[PDB]
Symmetry: C2
Subunit: 263 residues, 2 copies
Amino acid sequence: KSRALQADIVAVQSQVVYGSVGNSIAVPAIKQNGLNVFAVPTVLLSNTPHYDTFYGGAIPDEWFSGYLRALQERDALRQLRAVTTGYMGTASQIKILAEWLTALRKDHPDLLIMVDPVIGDIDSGIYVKPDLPEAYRQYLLPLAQGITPNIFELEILTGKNCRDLDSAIAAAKSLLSDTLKWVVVTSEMQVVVVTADSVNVISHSRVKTDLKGTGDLFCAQLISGLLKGKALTDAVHRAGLRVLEVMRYTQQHESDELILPPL
Amino acid sequence: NDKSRALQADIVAVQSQVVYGSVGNSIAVPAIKQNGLNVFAVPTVLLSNTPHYDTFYGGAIPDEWFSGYLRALQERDALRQLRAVTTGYMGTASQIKILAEWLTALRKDHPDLLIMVDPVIGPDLPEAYRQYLLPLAQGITPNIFELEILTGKNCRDLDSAIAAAKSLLSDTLKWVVVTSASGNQEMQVVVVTADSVNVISHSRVKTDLKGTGDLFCAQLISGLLKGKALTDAVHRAGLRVLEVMRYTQQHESDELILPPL
Ligand SMILES: Cc1ncc(CO)c(C=O)c1O
Ligand SMILES: Cc1ncc(CO)c(C=O)c1O
């Protein structure tokens, strides 16, 4: 009874008509690892707000709710192996998103969910809808099987520890459970992998640049190796090396926007 | 002029975009991309899938968004390499006015800009094109139903339809590619440039697969920015559409599926 398109992933996040970020850099990343995917956009702008202008807004909680729901009526989740979340637009979309996911596993009990808590940074955090960090903790976390937060996106989520690598691992540890299997804490110059029992600390050297999307690149390359048979740490180390690569090529290319080189 | 450290592209395709599916940019951008051509696609509507299904969600982009989007590309300075711009299924009519305006602007720094326009019609849509868009296109691809309403003329033969195309050429509008499916169905196409008339035909399969045109166009343009002579290009892109459909036929897909280049 299957003749409708099918896909591995159902990545839900930001989409730009200009710039490398959100599904506008992740989908191409995915496709390269030989994988099908569906991009359900949360917001739909012109460019990145951090630019100088930027137009467009967020997809309404009635359209965006239809999209996901559509992928189920169309029956294209026959080969679904994962769902990933990125830049959100409203804590209501996040609630919506959850309800959808929650119904999912009852058919895809082996579903992989991967959330990226897009909320803060060093300059200043919560540079997003203030309501998002609550929606994250109350709704979209009790499902994640492995999240990729950073030192500050982790402080907000746990209401816990700070700048001590240990304090961090602790806080991460306090997050694991039956559903959450792992956690990739960042601050990418130092990346700690905290498994349900074990700890790995990968570390490379990052260059200076205001390019946005690496997070989306990284995460993308991460679900790729994981949905391809790579071990956790092994997988991470690759999605991370890849992003350092990607960044060189655009610096070499002299372009304030990411550029997906070959495979 | 100093180098532009921003993203660039040859086309600025403008039409629909479906989360699930193969219509509009959702199939254009890929088709384009295959011929090794960069492109900025500007949405017009954002629907779950195409309306011709049991169910579909979404609507049409806010004028303001739809505008800022356009204005954007420029404030970002990512058009130095542009050469074309192609319309597609439009949500409103105001959009066209705006899309026009913008074009009007662009057309001042890019005198060699080829504007292709598909009269995706089948309420107010007629006029907006007549008044705002039509007067700008350097080429268009309406079918019989589309050429009839866009000229207000009727035409059930070569001469008739032809004269119509002729009755739309000018100092800006250069050619007029018309198409029809006679029925199963045939491809029946006619290339009505001002100084000549070509008519290419093909035998096509029987399907409910949409997007063939968006693709065809998507391809047509590509082959055109590659210095391929019109008529020649028109054929190829026609051929392309069939090839891809066969490919999809085999895989038995209810949506289109791009093979290799
Ligand atoms: C459009 C868009 N996409 C993705 C991100 C996060 O990388 C941001 C962060 O501000 C954004 O604005
Ligand atoms: C949304 C949408 N976009 C484009 C087309 C024509 O390719 C159709 C044809 O029905 C459509 O419904």
